[PDB]
Symmetry: C2
Subunit: 307 residues, 2 copies
């Protein structure tokens, strides 16, 4: 009972590291499905996927993250639960092995509930909070749907290479890095979204939420393509860019699960797996023949039936 | 030509402090008008207003911001430009007198473009501090504003010290894109130039990405209905805040098509606002309060007017 879709990042293609990206995606899916079969929450299953993705020294998230301008690792990560709509996030976080675990814990403590617990912490404060909650001290994304139709999403990143210290990207921002929202009065489908690419491009277009909105339309493939074209590549908010670089993985369910991935970057490695079927599928998505990176859109999808 | 609208201290009503809020809103508006009259950029004028608002010891922003759990000050601020649609923001920033000045500088630098890497739009903590100092921004030894210039260009900014006794590093809506403020000039799919600035419970404003939601709603002919529908449906009754016992927030908005419609709305007991036209002179300050019999966090208050520019 369950389905997962993950990505190891959207960016330059690597005919040498592609094998590494596909393997971690395979392992990440395995982790997520195993959690679901253990009867774990969708948030816990998406978190497990991200931990595996972060741990790969080949991914720009967690260990192996791009060093910033000071030669330090500063991580961004967030997670959202479709059932409760709660969210957890950390930005510019250093000294913590798995940034996504901190985000997940923040979301969980959020459930507990006068004063509303913090949903977004940065820097030292985020580090202090993590240690205070027993989280081990020392880009990638996933969307999941459990056997009950609940959806969750998460994203983790090391941010731009040599970025100025304190520079925060889309992986830490609400509505930008990921989105998870179960079916509701004005939300026909339970949708989950996770993004990757130039943080600035994804933030200014609030891409994750935008994709989720678009996905409430009848045709998911047309809906996502129009979003990537009009609300991203041709977005007036990115008129200041010479090429828009980003990728997304999406899941929509009602269990009938439709999943897609789309990117404007040269490539994007994805992986997916269905619980009642096993066997993780991986794929390096690349832009069509003679296409233009930052100017065109690659898009693919599939469907999963959860009995 | 030009118009400005600012706000300070959206929350509980305190007559003893009302006068103080009014005074700072008045000078913030004057600083903004002075800029515009001197042919300044809409973003510089809104920044000028925020500097004044932050400098008041009575506002939870800049000097006078609430202290966090460790007794330290950590500020959040952002500004957006309707012309270029560019944005600048800082979060959990300490050691800087006027957080909004850092966000405005980030925006200005970013507008310069890559021509040698994609400019940052959001910096936090120590890094934010270092960037500020490296860019000549005065260091140490919510409030908001929306503006429209004579050309119809709009801008908005917001600044806050966040929740009192908050955990170190907790960043609120004043630093988050689409939540604290929004500014967007008329376009092909946006018949109006709109500017929005928010205030209230950080959590509530973020979960609803209120500032942006307001700007999008305001693309409907009726501004008054657009704002009211948003505060009720997209805020108080939003499914994203269903578990909350009361939703607390306030917003100031400006929409131009030179015709300038300006409004403020809030679910808090009160909110102090100030507005001024570049041609009318004399700042107008007002303490907006919820109607009698209305419950804070459960109801909405809304007021405003129209201004003509030439």
């Amino acid at each position: 009972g369950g389905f997962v879709l993950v990505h190891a990042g959207a960016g330059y293609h690597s005919e040498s590291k592609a094998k590494e990206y596909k393997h971690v995606c395979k392992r990440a899916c395995q982790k997520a499905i195993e959690k679901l079969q253990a009867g774990a929450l969708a948030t816990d299953a998406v978190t497990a996927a991200l931990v595996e993705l972060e741990d790969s020294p080949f991914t720009n998230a967690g260990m192996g993250s791009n060093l910033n301008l000071l030669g330090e690792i500063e991580c961004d990560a967030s997670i959202m639960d479709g059932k409760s709509l709660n969210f957890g996030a950390v930005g510019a976080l250093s000294g913590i092995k798995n940034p996504v675990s901190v985000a997940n814990r923040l979301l969980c403590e959020g459930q507990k509930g006068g004063r509303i617990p913090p949903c977004f912490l940065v820097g030292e404060g985020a580090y202090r909070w993590a240690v205070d909650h027993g989280i081990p001290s020392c880009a990638v994304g996933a969307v999941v749907v459990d056997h009950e139709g609940n959806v969750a999403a998460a994203v983790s990143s090391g941010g731009l290479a040599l970025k100025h210290p304190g520079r925060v990207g889309q992986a830490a921002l609400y509505g930008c890095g990921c989105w998870a929202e179960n079916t509701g009065a004005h939300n026909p489908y339970s949708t989950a979204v996770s993004t990757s690419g130039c943080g600035e491009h994804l933030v200014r277009t609030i891409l994750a939420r935008e994709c989720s909105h678009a996905l409430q339309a009848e045709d998911a493939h047309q809906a996502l393509l129009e979003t990537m074209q009009n609300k991203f590549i041709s977005s007036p908010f990115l008129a200041s860019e010479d090429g828009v670089l980003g990728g997304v993985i999406v899941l929509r369910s009602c269990l009938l699960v439709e999943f897609l991935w789309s990117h404007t970057t040269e490539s994007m490695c994805v992986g997916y797996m269905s619980a009642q079927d096993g066997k993780a599928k991986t794929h390096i998505s690349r832009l069509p023949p003679g296409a233009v990176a930052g100017q065109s859109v690659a898009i693919e999808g599939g469907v999963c039936r959860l009995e």
